[PDB]
Design a protein around this nucleic acid. Structure first.
Ligand SMILES: [Mg+2]
Ligand SMILES: [Mg+2]
Ligand SMILES: [Mg+2]
Ligand SMILES: [Mg+2]
Ligand SMILES: [Mg+2]
Ligand SMILES: [Mg+2]
Ligand SMILES: [Mg+2]
Ligand SMILES: [Mg+2]
Ligand SMILES: [Mg+2]
Ligand SMILES: [Mg+2]
Ligand SMILES: [Mg+2]
Ligand SMILES: [Mg+2]
Ligand SMILES: [Mg+2]
Ligand SMILES: [Mg+2]
Ligand SMILES: [Mg+2]
Ligand SMILES: [Mg+2]
Ligand SMILES: [Mg+2]
Ligand SMILES: [Mg+2]
Ligand SMILES: [Mg+2]
Ligand SMILES: [Mg+2]
Ligand SMILES: [Mg+2]
Ligand SMILES: [Mg+2]
Ligand SMILES: [Mg+2]
Ligand SMILES: [Mg+2]
Ligand SMILES: [Mg+2]
Ligand SMILES: [Mg+2]
Ligand SMILES: [Mg+2]
Ligand SMILES: [Mg+2]
Ligand SMILES: [Mg+2]
Ligand SMILES: [Mg+2]
Ligand SMILES: [Mg+2]
Ligand SMILES: [Mg+2]
Ligand SMILES: [Mg+2]
Ligand SMILES: [Mg+2]
Ligand SMILES: [Mg+2]
Ligand SMILES: [Mg+2]
Ligand SMILES: [Mg+2]
Ligand SMILES: [Mg+2]
Ligand SMILES: [Mg+2]
Ligand SMILES: [Mg+2]
Ligand SMILES: [Mg+2]
Ligand SMILES: [Mg+2]
Lengths: 150, 138, 234
RNA sequence: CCUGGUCCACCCGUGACGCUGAGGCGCGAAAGCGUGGGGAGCAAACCGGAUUAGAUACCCGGGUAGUCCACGCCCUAAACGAUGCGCGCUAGGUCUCUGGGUCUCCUGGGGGCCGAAGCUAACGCGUUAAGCGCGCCGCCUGGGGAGUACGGCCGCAAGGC
RNA sequence: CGUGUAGGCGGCCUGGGGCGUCCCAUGUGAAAGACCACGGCUCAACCGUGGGGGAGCGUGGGAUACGCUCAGGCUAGACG
């Protein structure tokens, strides 16, 4: 069990004789606040059900956010489909300047100071998965040269 | 006919790497080896060496990759996730000593040609100089 | 002892319908077929069994699978003759990946396995007597080797990976050491402990699978003679 | 008979002489136009016959310009792979046209299918790229108004840019 | 669709010049405003004082990897 704050909830719909049938999509974020965040998108016949599943699916999908002093290790641009996203680390006591999404995710990420911006499609879902792959691609001076050993 | 040989070398490298290959052979070029030497002197490649494909002198460039991975797509991470030429023949890119780039918040590099040799985003800065911002790796 | 056996008739397989990745394991193309390099094979066999052994001695269960006919039977053997779970029939989808749910059937097995011998048989209409009895025939028809341990494997051994790559996948998403005997018609990369060598000629299958189970037992105590291999083996 | 481009082989010659390309010049289906010739078949228009509520159509019977040729104009198009050109780099499998060899094979050029990595909104693309790169040109910037109006340039006109 | 003018872009190696480019020094860049302190009116708004930064451009000295250029050579591009 972590923070567990849901990005967005919606009501999709499908067609069939007699009428349209519904379902619900819930996108949730789950982070401890020490460098662990998970992103799960849950769909099911009812809001609650959706919600929960999002959580479950989330925990089952997380990532080690290599924080540092309260911000990200370095600048990063990540294109994911139509969506794009920039992430720039700000000096301590700066703020988490990002839109609803990258925030909600980055808040639990553990970061307290980071500069951002949504580029291209601002779609939640996609920016969401966008933010993830962003983090999931960060590096530290250590694990950096840790690779260039030789 | 190759307009910018250098941008090529990088691309040849940027491609061979994206597939995980032992070595690649970029055509002989003093100035090229420079970007190479530096590329290695900074630990991005196992190294390189001169050869000859029938009177055709190339340069074997041994690529360095990471450790195998756990899970789907057990494809080993790479040492160079990104190389891209800056100063292109279609638009020369020069920088003053105060203008030199800060590649990947320091984790990165930025090879560049200077009046006094081929230095990097730190070296050149230390020498306190400037010149054609050749490119950037990391 | 090793070489000779293999050199015997257990190498070189699929021809001209390969995978370039597997180009590191192959000597040449004789009259068409790809003659896998045993020299290297050996080396790999090592690291593989090393792992097996470094596991067979630490109380770890392994799951073997082979859904191909030219390798079914044997796999059924080597498994029971080692207490290691296995799959000889249709490798259900989401086994490892949806274990908890697949298990649900395993439980349904005994659910009947018990109602099998009972006085409740005095009643019950022929409708069910046939329904259940049948519902068990198949039930029992698929889990005969997928029950034993009610816990995921620490690894999985397999014949032709690509043939059962689906299992492999499941395994890989769940992080589970993958070991298998693959020939030239398969991609290594997504295989952890690769046993390069013929995947159809039961000749090679038996061998590589045999010395495997023994090795599983050498780390348990009870070295004996081989298992029933010949019965119609050519 | 006259003539263009292109492919392979031989390491013979030159020695960066290259790529692109505003403007310019040329070519440019069909329809259409000018002078002259030709005319079987087909056939806008046209006239009948049916069909229909009507049938300025679809179907049937006729029918001219045209379709053909010479010389000269017009210069448009779903002029389409709806994908500018040049070069480099990045798994294979399959069948097929064509060239060479100490010819079950090896190697060069082209056309198709399936597909690595990777790309894509998806469809799909995938060494014939829509992948990773560089050079140069062309072009786009919500829908209707409108490819219209005006001006200019071209054309015999229809019209075109 | 093609041909091609101007223009844009250009393989490998050795040397000379040093226009682009880069460094140093110096002139310049009014004051006001903008930023940092400190003080003056009860505070502030206004205002004073000191400090710190300014691209650009000139002159003087220097560097030569890359673009440029002249010169000598090569054969992987191109042509025969
Ligand atoms: Mg129905
Ligand atoms: Mg990490
Ligand atoms: Mg996607
Ligand atoms: Mg995009
Ligand atoms: Mg948008
Ligand atoms: Mg000819
Ligand atoms: Mg010659
Ligand atoms: Mg000569
Ligand atoms: Mg015409
Ligand atoms: Mg005509
Ligand atoms: Mg007329
Ligand atoms: Mg007629
Ligand atoms: Mg008629
Ligand atoms: Mg009538
Ligand atoms: Mg009617
Ligand atoms: Mg004519
Ligand atoms: Mg004309
Ligand atoms: Mg049209
Ligand atoms: Mg077409
Ligand atoms: Mg071909
Ligand atoms: Mg054709
Ligand atoms: Mg793929
Ligand atoms: Mg395809
Ligand atoms: Mg190729
Ligand atoms: Mg092909
Ligand atoms: Mg595209
Ligand atoms: Mg063009
Ligand atoms: Mg408007
Ligand atoms: Mg409008
Ligand atoms: Mg007009
Ligand atoms: Mg007129
Ligand atoms: Mg007329
Ligand atoms: Mg041209
Ligand atoms: Mg020129
Ligand atoms: Mg100068
Ligand atoms: Mg300057
Ligand atoms: Mg000054
Ligand atoms: Mg001032
Ligand atoms: Mg005061
Ligand atoms: Mg002042
Ligand atoms: Mg200055
Ligand atoms: Mg010369």
């Amino acid at each position: 069990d972590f923070e567990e704050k849901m990005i967005l909830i919606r009501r999709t719909a499908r067609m069939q004789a007699g009428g349209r049938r519904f379902r619900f999509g819930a996108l949730v974020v789950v982070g401890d606040r020490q460098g662990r965040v998970g992103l799960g998108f849950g769909k099911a016949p009812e809001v609650p059900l959706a919600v929960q599943k999002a959580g479950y699916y989330a925990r089952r999908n997380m990532v080690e956010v290599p924080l540092q002093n309260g911000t990200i290790p370095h600048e990063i641009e990540v294109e994911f489909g139509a969506s794009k996203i920039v992430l720039k680390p700000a000096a301590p006591g700066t703020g988490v300047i990002a839109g609803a999404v990258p925030r909600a995710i980055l808040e639990l990420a553990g970061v307290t100071d980071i500069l951002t911006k949504e580029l291209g499609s601002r779609n939640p879902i996609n920016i969401a998965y966008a933010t993830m792959e962003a983090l999931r691609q960060l590096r530290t001076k250590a694990d950096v040269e840790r690779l260039r050993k030789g | 006919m190759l307009t910018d040989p250098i941008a090529d070398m990088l691309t040849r490298i940027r491609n061979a790497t994206r597939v995980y290959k032992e070595s690649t052979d970029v055509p002989a070029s003093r100035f090229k080896e420079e970007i190479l030497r530096i590329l290695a002197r900074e630990g991005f490649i196992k190294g390189y060496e001169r050869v000859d494909v029938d009177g055709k002198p190339y340069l074997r460039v041994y690529l360095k990759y990471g450790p195998r991975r756990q899970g789907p797509d057990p494809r080993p991470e790479q040492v160079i996730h990104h190389i891209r030429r800056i100063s292109k023949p279609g638009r020369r890119v020069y920088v003053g000593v105060k203008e030199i780039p800060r590649v990947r918040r320091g984790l990165g590099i930025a090879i560049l040609s200077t009046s006094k040799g081929v230095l990097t985003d730190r070296e050149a800065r230390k020498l306190g100089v400037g010149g054609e911002l050749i490119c950037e790796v990391w | 002892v090793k070489e000779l056996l293999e050199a015997g008739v257990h190498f070189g397989h699929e021809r001209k319908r390969w995978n370039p990745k597997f180009a590191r394991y192959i000597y040449a193309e004789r009259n068409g077929i790809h003659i896998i390099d045993l020299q290297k094979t050996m080396e790999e066999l090592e690291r593989t069994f090393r792992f097996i052994e470094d596991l067979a001695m630490r109380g770890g269960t392994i799951l073997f699978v082979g859904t191909k006919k030219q390798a079914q039977d044997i796999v059924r053997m080597e498994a029971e003759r080692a207490g290691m779970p296995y799959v000889n029939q249709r490798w259900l989808g989401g086994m490892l990946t949806n274990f908890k749910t697949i298990s649900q059937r395993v439980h349904r097995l005994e659910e009947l396995e018990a109602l099998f011998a009972s006085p409740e048989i005095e009643e019950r209409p022929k409708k069910e007597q046939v329904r259940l009895k049948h519902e068990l025939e198949r039930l029992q028809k698929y889990l005969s080797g997928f029950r034993l341990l009610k816990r995921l494997p620490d690894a999985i051994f397999v014949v032709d990976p690509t043939k059962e790559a689906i299992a492999v996948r499941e395994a890989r998403k769940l992080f589970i050491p993958v070991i298998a005997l693959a020939d030239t018609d398969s991609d290594p990369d997504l295989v952890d402990y690769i046993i390069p060598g013929n995947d159809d000629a039961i000749r090679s299958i038996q061998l590589i699978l045999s010395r495997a189970v023994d090795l599983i037992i050498q780390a348990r105590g009870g070295v004996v003679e081989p298992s029933p291999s010949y019965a119609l083996v050519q």
